[PDB]
Protein backbone atom coordinates (compact mmCIF):
# COMPACT_ATOMS: atom_id res chain seq x y z
CA UNK A 1 0.00 0.00 0.00
CA UNK A 2 2.75 2.18 0.53
CA UNK A 3 3.74 3.74 -2.66
CA UNK A 4 6.01 5.98 -4.20
CA UNK A 5 5.62 7.16 -7.74
CA UNK A 6 8.49 9.51 -9.09
CA UNK A 7 8.80 12.78 -11.71
CA UNK A 8 9.67 11.57 -15.20
CA UNK A 9 12.81 11.66 -16.08
CA UNK A 10 14.06 15.37 -16.46
CA UNK A 11 16.56 17.00 -18.10
CA UNK A 12 18.08 20.71 -17.34
CA UNK A 13 20.64 23.45 -18.51
CA UNK A 14 24.00 24.10 -16.45
CA UNK A 15 22.76 26.76 -13.80
CA UNK A 16 19.03 26.13 -14.13
CA UNK A 17 16.59 25.35 -11.08
CA UNK A 18 15.16 21.92 -11.13
CA UNK A 19 12.37 20.25 -9.12
CA UNK A 20 11.56 16.68 -8.77
CA UNK A 21 8.79 15.08 -7.52
CA UNK A 22 8.01 12.11 -5.20
CA UNK A 23 4.28 11.25 -4.60
CA UNK A 24 3.12 9.31 -1.60
CA UNK A 25 0.00 6.38 -1.53
CA UNK A 26 -2.37 9.37 -0.83
CA UNK A 27 -3.35 7.87 2.82
CA UNK A 28 0.49 7.71 3.66
CA UNK A 29 -0.35 11.85 2.68
CA UNK A 30 1.40 13.07 6.01
CA UNK A 31 4.65 11.01 5.86
CA UNK A 32 8.77 11.88 6.37
CA UNK A 33 10.35 11.19 2.55
CA UNK A 34 14.01 10.37 2.38
CA UNK A 35 16.01 11.44 -0.64
CA UNK A 36 18.78 9.92 -2.55
CA UNK A 37 21.43 10.53 -5.00
CA UNK A 38 23.35 7.99 -7.19
CA UNK A 39 26.25 9.03 -9.44
CA UNK A 40 27.28 6.66 -12.23
CA UNK A 41 29.09 3.67 -10.48
CA UNK A 42 28.78 5.04 -7.07
CA UNK A 43 26.84 3.91 -4.45
CA UNK A 44 23.49 6.37 -3.71
CA UNK A 45 24.42 9.16 -1.18
CA UNK A 46 21.64 10.37 1.33
CA UNK A 47 20.31 13.88 0.54
CA UNK A 48 17.71 14.79 3.12
CA UNK A 49 14.88 13.83 5.20
CA UNK A 50 11.76 15.82 4.28
CA UNK A 51 8.99 16.24 6.15
CA UNK A 52 4.77 16.85 5.29
CA UNK A 53 5.53 20.65 6.52
CA UNK A 54 8.26 20.85 4.14
CA UNK A 55 10.82 21.18 6.72
CA UNK A 56 14.09 19.22 5.11
CA UNK A 57 17.78 17.94 7.09
CA UNK A 58 20.40 17.67 4.44
CA UNK A 59 23.11 14.55 4.74
CA UNK A 60 27.04 15.40 4.89
CA UNK A 61 28.72 17.20 1.90
CA UNK A 62 25.28 18.28 0.40
CA UNK A 63 25.59 21.94 -0.98
CA UNK A 64 23.05 24.73 0.38
CA UNK A 65 21.79 24.33 -3.43
CA UNK A 66 19.75 21.71 -2.45
CA UNK A 67 15.79 22.21 -0.40
CA UNK A 68 13.30 20.50 -0.28
CA UNK A 69 9.26 21.34 0.06
CA UNK A 70 5.82 19.50 0.18
CA UNK A 71 1.88 19.88 -0.89
CA UNK A 72 -0.51 17.48 -0.10
CA UNK A 73 1.22 13.81 -0.93
CA UNK A 74 3.66 15.72 -2.93
CA UNK A 75 7.16 15.81 -2.18
CA UNK A 76 9.63 18.00 -3.82
CA UNK A 77 13.64 18.05 -4.16
CA UNK A 78 14.72 21.07 -5.74
CA UNK A 79 18.25 22.41 -7.48
CA UNK A 80 19.20 25.33 -7.68
CA UNK A 81 22.43 26.28 -10.33
CA UNK A 82 22.24 22.84 -11.09
CA UNK A 83 25.66 21.72 -11.93
CA UNK A 84 27.54 18.50 -13.63
CA UNK A 85 28.35 16.97 -10.05
CA UNK A 86 24.69 17.00 -10.04
CA UNK A 87 23.69 14.74 -12.69
CA UNK A 88 22.10 11.56 -11.20
CA UNK A 89 19.11 9.13 -10.59
CA UNK A 90 17.59 10.67 -7.20
CA UNK A 91 15.60 8.27 -5.41
CA UNK A 92 12.97 8.16 -2.55
CA UNK A 93 12.59 6.46 0.02
CA UNK A 94 9.53 5.86 2.94
CA UNK A 95 9.48 3.94 6.16
CA UNK A 96 6.42 2.19 8.19
CA UNK A 97 4.81 -0.51 10.41
CA UNK A 98 3.20 -2.32 8.44
CA UNK A 99 2.10 -5.90 9.78
CA UNK A 100 3.94 -4.82 12.77
CA UNK A 101 7.02 -5.57 10.82
CA UNK A 102 9.11 -2.59 9.49
CA UNK A 103 9.54 -1.92 5.61
CA UNK A 104 11.53 0.89 4.00
CA UNK A 105 10.55 1.12 -0.10
CA UNK A 106 12.11 2.78 -2.38
CA UNK A 107 10.69 4.73 -5.49
CA UNK A 108 11.88 3.71 -9.22
CA UNK A 109 14.06 6.81 -9.10
CA UNK A 110 14.02 10.09 -12.21
CA UNK A 111 17.35 9.75 -14.22
CA UNK A 112 18.56 14.16 -13.97
CA UNK A 113 20.32 14.96 -17.23
CA UNK A 114 22.15 18.37 -17.10
CA UNK A 115 22.60 19.76 -20.44
CA UNK A 116 24.85 22.76 -22.30
CA UNK A 117 28.00 20.72 -20.03
CA UNK A 118 31.60 21.79 -20.80
CA UNK A 119 31.94 19.52 -23.98
CA UNK A 120 35.12 17.58 -25.51
CA UNK A 121 34.17 16.21 -28.68
CA UNK A 122 35.10 12.54 -29.15
CA UNK A 123 38.27 11.01 -30.90
CA UNK A 124 37.50 7.83 -32.85
CA UNK A 125 40.18 5.04 -33.68
CA UNK A 126 38.70 1.95 -35.72
CA UNK A 127 40.60 -1.41 -36.27
CA UNK A 128 40.24 -3.60 -39.13
CA UNK A 129 40.34 -7.81 -38.36
CA UNK A 130 44.02 -9.05 -38.27
CA UNK A 131 45.08 -11.26 -40.94
CA UNK A 132 45.55 -13.99 -38.20
CA UNK A 133 41.63 -13.47 -37.65
CA UNK A 134 40.67 -13.62 -40.59
CA UNK A 135 42.39 -17.07 -41.18
CA UNK A 136 39.95 -17.93 -38.67
CA UNK A 137 37.12 -17.23 -41.37
CA UNK A 138 36.25 -14.38 -38.24
CA UNK A 139 36.36 -10.54 -38.54
CA UNK A 140 35.97 -8.38 -35.42
CA UNK A 141 35.78 -4.51 -36.07
CA UNK A 142 37.35 -2.91 -33.34
CA UNK A 143 35.47 1.24 -32.38
CA UNK A 144 37.70 2.98 -29.66
CA UNK A 145 36.90 6.25 -28.33
CA UNK A 146 38.34 8.23 -26.33
CA UNK A 147 38.92 12.62 -24.72
CA UNK A 148 35.21 12.82 -24.90
CA UNK A 149 33.40 14.98 -21.53
CA UNK A 150 30.08 14.52 -20.67
CA UNK A 151 30.70 10.87 -20.96
CA UNK A 152 26.99 10.47 -22.69
CA UNK A 153 27.61 8.51 -26.33
CA UNK A 154 25.64 6.55 -28.91
CA UNK A 155 27.09 3.90 -31.15
CA UNK A 156 25.97 3.11 -34.33
CA UNK A 157 28.12 0.58 -36.81
CA UNK A 158 27.83 0.98 -40.87
CA UNK A 159 28.04 -1.29 -44.08
CA UNK A 160 27.56 0.54 -46.79
CA UNK A 161 26.23 3.66 -45.41
CA UNK A 162 23.17 1.31 -44.33
CA UNK A 163 22.72 -0.05 -40.38
CA UNK A 164 24.24 -3.21 -39.32
CA UNK A 165 22.70 -3.87 -35.50
CA UNK A 166 24.02 -7.31 -34.82
CA UNK A 167 26.93 -8.50 -33.34
CA UNK A 168 27.59 -5.55 -32.11
CA UNK A 169 29.09 -5.15 -28.32
CA UNK A 170 29.04 -1.66 -27.07
CA UNK A 171 30.69 -0.77 -23.29
CA UNK A 172 29.49 2.00 -20.93
CA UNK A 173 31.52 5.21 -20.61
CA UNK A 174 34.45 5.17 -18.02
CA UNK A 175 36.39 7.72 -16.28
CA UNK A 176 39.94 8.35 -18.29
CA UNK A 177 42.08 11.75 -16.46
CA UNK A 178 38.96 14.16 -16.73
CA UNK A 179 37.72 12.54 -19.17
CA UNK A 180 35.75 9.27 -20.35
CA UNK A 181 36.31 6.15 -23.00
CA UNK A 182 34.62 3.42 -24.59
CA UNK A 183 34.60 0.78 -26.73
CA UNK A 184 32.59 -0.94 -29.81
CA UNK A 185 33.16 -4.44 -31.27
CA UNK A 186 31.56 -5.43 -34.11
CA UNK A 187 31.97 -9.31 -34.90
CA UNK A 188 31.10 -10.41 -38.77
CA UNK A 189 32.63 -13.35 -40.86
CA UNK A 190 35.75 -12.49 -43.17
CA UNK A 191 32.93 -12.85 -46.13
CA UNK A 192 31.19 -10.11 -44.57
CA UNK A 193 34.49 -8.32 -44.34
CA UNK A 194 36.11 -8.78 -47.49
CA UNK A 195 32.09 -8.57 -49.22
CA UNK A 196 31.18 -4.88 -48.47
CA UNK A 197 32.92 -1.67 -49.61
CA UNK A 198 33.07 0.13 -46.25
CA UNK A 199 31.85 0.09 -42.40
CA UNK A 200 31.66 3.02 -40.27
CA UNK A 201 31.63 3.36 -36.59
CA UNK A 202 29.49 6.77 -36.13
CA UNK A 203 29.29 8.24 -32.68
CA UNK A 204 26.75 10.58 -31.34
CA UNK A 205 27.70 13.25 -28.38
CA UNK A 206 26.12 16.10 -27.13
CA UNK A 207 23.99 16.84 -30.50
CA UNK A 208 27.14 16.57 -32.67
CA UNK A 209 28.49 12.80 -34.52
CA UNK A 210 31.73 12.08 -35.44
CA UNK A 211 31.78 9.36 -37.81
CA UNK A 212 35.05 6.89 -39.46
CA UNK A 213 35.13 4.49 -41.87
CA UNK A 214 37.40 1.93 -42.98
CA UNK A 215 38.08 0.04 -46.41
CA UNK A 216 39.00 -3.63 -47.14
CA UNK A 217 39.79 -2.46 -50.15
CA UNK A 218 43.98 -1.68 -51.63
CA UNK A 219 45.12 2.06 -51.72
CA UNK A 220 45.49 1.96 -55.30
CA UNK B 1 34.98 9.74 9.18
CA UNK B 2 31.49 7.20 9.84
CA UNK B 3 32.34 3.67 7.12
CA UNK B 4 31.08 0.95 6.46
CA UNK B 5 33.95 -1.32 4.92
CA UNK B 6 32.22 -3.99 2.25
CA UNK B 7 33.74 -7.87 1.26
CA UNK B 8 34.93 -8.07 -1.98
CA UNK B 9 33.47 -8.82 -5.40
CA UNK B 10 32.29 -12.73 -5.28
CA UNK B 11 31.85 -14.92 -8.37
CA UNK B 12 29.88 -18.38 -7.05
CA UNK B 13 27.88 -21.03 -9.24
CA UNK B 14 24.30 -21.38 -8.52
CA UNK B 15 22.22 -23.53 -6.19
CA UNK B 16 25.40 -22.20 -3.58
CA UNK B 17 25.19 -19.57 -0.86
CA UNK B 18 27.42 -16.59 -0.05
CA UNK B 19 28.15 -14.32 3.10
CA UNK B 20 28.80 -10.50 2.44
CA UNK B 21 30.39 -8.30 5.64
CA UNK B 22 29.80 -5.23 6.62
CA UNK B 23 32.52 -3.75 8.92
CA UNK B 24 31.64 -0.34 10.85
CA UNK B 25 34.10 2.34 12.22
CA UNK B 26 34.04 5.52 13.36
CA UNK B 27 30.80 5.25 14.79
CA UNK B 28 28.73 3.56 18.04
CA UNK B 29 27.80 0.53 16.21
CA UNK B 30 24.60 -0.63 18.73
CA UNK B 31 23.19 3.20 18.58
CA UNK B 32 22.63 2.42 15.00
CA UNK B 33 21.28 0.06 12.42
CA UNK B 34 22.47 -1.96 9.66
CA UNK B 35 19.84 -2.05 6.13
CA UNK B 36 20.62 -4.44 2.99
CA UNK B 37 19.69 -3.05 -0.16
CA UNK B 38 20.01 -4.85 -3.15
CA UNK B 39 20.86 -3.52 -7.17
CA UNK B 40 20.77 -5.08 -9.97
CA UNK B 41 22.72 -4.33 -13.50
CA UNK B 42 20.17 -1.61 -14.90
CA UNK B 43 17.62 -1.69 -12.15
CA UNK B 44 16.52 0.23 -9.24
CA UNK B 45 17.06 -0.18 -5.13
CA UNK B 46 15.37 -3.11 -3.41
CA UNK B 47 15.29 -2.75 0.19
CA UNK B 48 16.26 -6.27 1.62
CA UNK B 49 16.10 -5.61 5.52
CA UNK B 50 17.41 -4.23 8.94
CA UNK B 51 19.31 -5.93 11.50
CA UNK B 52 19.56 -3.82 14.96
CA UNK B 53 23.20 -4.98 16.44
CA UNK B 54 22.00 -3.69 19.54
CA UNK B 55 19.05 -6.29 19.95
CA UNK B 56 19.77 -8.49 17.06
CA UNK B 57 16.36 -7.90 16.04
CA UNK B 58 15.49 -8.28 12.40
CA UNK B 59 12.86 -7.15 9.71
CA UNK B 60 13.06 -8.57 6.38
CA UNK B 61 10.99 -7.18 2.89
CA UNK B 62 8.83 -10.22 2.37
CA UNK B 63 10.43 -10.86 -0.91
CA UNK B 64 13.89 -11.87 0.47
CA UNK B 65 12.35 -13.64 3.83
CA UNK B 66 14.09 -17.30 3.17
CA UNK B 67 16.54 -15.75 0.27
CA UNK B 68 18.61 -13.36 3.00
CA UNK B 69 19.85 -13.97 6.37
CA UNK B 70 21.40 -11.00 8.38
CA UNK B 71 23.52 -11.14 11.48
CA UNK B 72 25.47 -8.65 13.42
CA UNK B 73 28.73 -9.18 15.56
CA UNK B 74 29.11 -6.21 18.36
CA UNK B 75 32.42 -7.48 19.31
CA UNK B 76 33.70 -7.31 16.00
CA UNK B 77 31.29 -4.11 14.80
CA UNK B 78 31.01 -6.58 11.52
CA UNK B 79 27.23 -6.84 10.01
CA UNK B 80 26.56 -9.82 7.52
CA UNK B 81 24.17 -11.11 5.07
CA UNK B 82 24.17 -14.74 4.14
CA UNK B 83 22.12 -15.03 0.56
CA UNK B 84 21.18 -18.93 -0.21
CA UNK B 85 19.96 -21.24 -2.85
CA UNK B 86 21.70 -18.55 -5.31
CA UNK B 87 20.47 -18.11 -8.70
CA UNK B 88 20.90 -15.71 -11.52
CA UNK B 89 18.21 -13.59 -10.52
CA UNK B 90 20.49 -13.23 -7.07
CA UNK B 91 23.16 -11.21 -9.58
CA UNK B 92 23.06 -7.75 -8.34
CA UNK B 93 25.63 -4.79 -5.84
CA UNK B 94 24.62 -5.68 -2.19
CA UNK B 95 24.74 -2.62 0.00
CA UNK B 96 24.99 -2.04 3.83
CA UNK B 97 23.91 1.20 4.55
CA UNK B 98 23.54 2.94 8.30
CA UNK B 99 19.94 4.29 10.52
CA UNK B 100 18.53 4.87 12.96
CA UNK B 101 16.14 3.37 15.56
CA UNK B 102 13.54 5.73 14.88
CA UNK B 103 13.80 7.23 11.48
CA UNK B 104 14.21 6.11 7.87
CA UNK B 105 17.40 7.68 6.39
CA UNK B 106 20.36 5.30 5.49
CA UNK B 107 22.72 8.30 6.34
CA UNK B 108 25.92 6.21 5.10
CA UNK B 109 26.18 3.44 2.60
CA UNK B 110 28.95 0.61 2.15
CA UNK B 111 31.20 0.71 -1.09
CA UNK B 112 28.80 -2.14 -2.32
CA UNK B 113 29.71 -5.94 -2.90
CA UNK B 114 29.09 -7.25 -6.25
CA UNK B 115 27.49 -11.04 -6.34
CA UNK B 116 28.08 -12.43 -9.81
CA UNK B 117 26.04 -16.25 -9.77
CA UNK B 118 27.24 -17.48 -12.97
CA UNK B 119 28.58 -21.44 -14.47
CA UNK B 120 31.06 -18.94 -17.07
CA UNK B 121 34.36 -21.31 -17.43
CA UNK B 122 38.31 -19.77 -16.85
CA UNK B 123 39.08 -19.31 -20.70
CA UNK B 124 42.24 -17.68 -21.98
CA UNK B 125 42.39 -14.89 -24.06
CA UNK B 126 42.80 -14.88 -28.24
CA UNK B 127 45.16 -11.82 -28.54
CA UNK B 128 45.24 -10.55 -32.13
CA UNK B 129 47.80 -7.62 -33.21
CA UNK B 130 46.02 -4.21 -34.63
CA UNK B 131 47.56 -2.35 -37.57
CA UNK B 132 45.80 0.05 -39.67
CA UNK B 133 44.59 0.14 -42.94
CA UNK B 134 46.85 1.31 -45.21
CA UNK B 135 44.15 4.20 -45.14
CA UNK B 136 45.35 5.02 -41.41
CA UNK B 137 49.57 5.17 -42.24
CA UNK B 138 49.32 8.30 -44.19
CA UNK B 139 49.81 10.54 -40.70
CA UNK B 140 52.38 12.06 -38.92
CA UNK B 141 51.17 9.84 -35.62
CA UNK B 142 50.37 6.12 -35.87
CA UNK B 143 47.91 3.94 -33.66
CA UNK B 144 48.67 0.48 -33.24
CA UNK B 145 46.04 -1.75 -31.05
CA UNK B 146 45.66 -5.28 -29.46
CA UNK B 147 42.37 -7.11 -29.35
CA UNK B 148 42.01 -9.31 -26.16
CA UNK B 149 38.87 -11.40 -27.35
CA UNK B 150 36.55 -13.92 -25.25
CA UNK B 151 38.17 -14.46 -21.78
CA UNK B 152 37.05 -15.06 -18.38
CA UNK B 153 37.33 -14.41 -15.37
CA UNK B 154 38.79 -10.41 -15.19
CA UNK B 155 40.99 -9.03 -15.43
CA UNK B 156 43.86 -9.20 -17.81
CA UNK B 157 47.22 -6.77 -17.70
CA UNK B 158 48.21 -5.48 -20.93
CA UNK B 159 51.45 -3.68 -21.18
CA UNK B 160 53.45 -2.32 -24.76
CA UNK B 161 57.00 -3.03 -25.16
CA UNK B 162 57.02 -4.53 -21.56
CA UNK B 163 56.19 -1.39 -20.53
CA UNK B 164 58.92 0.68 -22.50
CA UNK B 165 55.59 2.14 -24.08
CA UNK B 166 53.93 4.07 -21.49
CA UNK B 167 52.43 7.13 -23.06
CA UNK B 168 50.39 7.40 -25.66
CA UNK B 169 48.46 4.13 -24.21
CA UNK B 170 44.74 4.07 -24.06
CA UNK B 171 43.72 0.50 -22.76
CA UNK B 172 39.69 0.21 -22.74
CA UNK B 173 37.73 -1.14 -19.96
CA UNK B 174 36.29 -5.09 -21.53
CA UNK B 175 32.57 -6.07 -22.86
CA UNK B 176 30.90 -8.46 -21.73
CA UNK B 177 29.47 -11.36 -24.29
CA UNK B 178 28.00 -14.49 -22.84
CA UNK B 179 30.25 -15.18 -20.39
CA UNK B 180 33.40 -13.86 -22.65
CA UNK B 181 35.21 -10.34 -21.63
CA UNK B 182 36.95 -8.92 -25.16
CA UNK B 183 39.11 -5.59 -24.59
CA UNK B 184 41.50 -3.44 -26.96
CA UNK B 185 44.52 -1.17 -26.33
CA UNK B 186 45.91 1.13 -28.48
CA UNK B 187 49.25 2.90 -28.67
CA UNK B 188 50.00 6.20 -30.78
CA UNK B 189 53.78 7.22 -31.63
CA UNK B 190 55.47 9.13 -34.35
CA UNK B 191 55.18 7.55 -38.03
CA UNK B 192 58.75 7.75 -37.94
CA UNK B 193 58.84 5.02 -34.87
CA UNK B 194 56.87 2.27 -36.42
CA UNK B 195 57.07 -0.18 -38.27
CA UNK B 196 61.11 0.43 -38.02
CA UNK B 197 61.11 0.03 -34.29
CA UNK B 198 59.61 -3.37 -32.82
CA UNK B 199 56.04 -2.71 -31.02
CA UNK B 200 54.88 -5.68 -29.18
CA UNK B 201 51.22 -5.50 -26.67
CA UNK B 202 52.02 -7.84 -23.62
CA UNK B 203 48.84 -9.17 -22.52
CA UNK B 204 48.94 -11.53 -19.00
CA UNK B 205 45.86 -13.75 -18.15
CA UNK B 206 46.95 -14.41 -14.51
CA UNK B 207 43.68 -16.93 -14.49
CA UNK B 208 44.47 -18.88 -16.79
CA UNK B 209 48.91 -18.40 -16.18
CA UNK B 210 49.18 -17.27 -19.53
CA UNK B 211 50.94 -14.27 -21.13
CA UNK B 212 50.59 -13.60 -24.68
CA UNK B 213 53.39 -11.07 -26.24
CA UNK B 214 52.11 -9.86 -29.87
CA UNK B 215 54.63 -8.32 -32.48
CA UNK B 216 52.38 -5.58 -34.91
CA UNK B 217 53.34 -6.35 -37.97
CA UNK B 218 52.36 -4.12 -41.03
CA UNK C 1 0.55 7.91 11.19
CA UNK C 2 3.89 6.94 10.28
CA UNK C 3 5.54 4.95 13.10
CA UNK C 4 9.52 3.33 12.70
CA UNK C 5 11.03 1.04 15.56
CA UNK C 6 13.71 -1.08 14.28
Redesign the interface.
Same mark, same amino acid.
Given at each position: QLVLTQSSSASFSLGASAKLTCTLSSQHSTYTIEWYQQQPLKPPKYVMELKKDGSHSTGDGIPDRFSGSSSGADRYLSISNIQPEDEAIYICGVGDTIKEQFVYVFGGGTKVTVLGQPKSTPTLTVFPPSSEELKENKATLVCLISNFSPSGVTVAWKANGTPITQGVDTSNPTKEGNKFMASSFLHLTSDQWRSHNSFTCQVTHEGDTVEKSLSPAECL | Q?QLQQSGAALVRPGTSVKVSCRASEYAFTNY?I #?W +?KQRPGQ *?? #? $?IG?I?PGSG /?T???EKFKGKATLIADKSSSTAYMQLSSLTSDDSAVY?C?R?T??? &? @???? $? &?? /?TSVTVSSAKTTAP?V? %?? @???? /??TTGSSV?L *?C?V?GYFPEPVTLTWNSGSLSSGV?T? %? @? +???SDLY?? !?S !?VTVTSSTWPSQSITCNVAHPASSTKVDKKIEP | VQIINK
Open positions: - | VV #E +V *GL #E $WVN /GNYNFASYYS &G @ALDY $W &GQ /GSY %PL @APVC /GDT *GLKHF %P @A +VLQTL !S !S | -
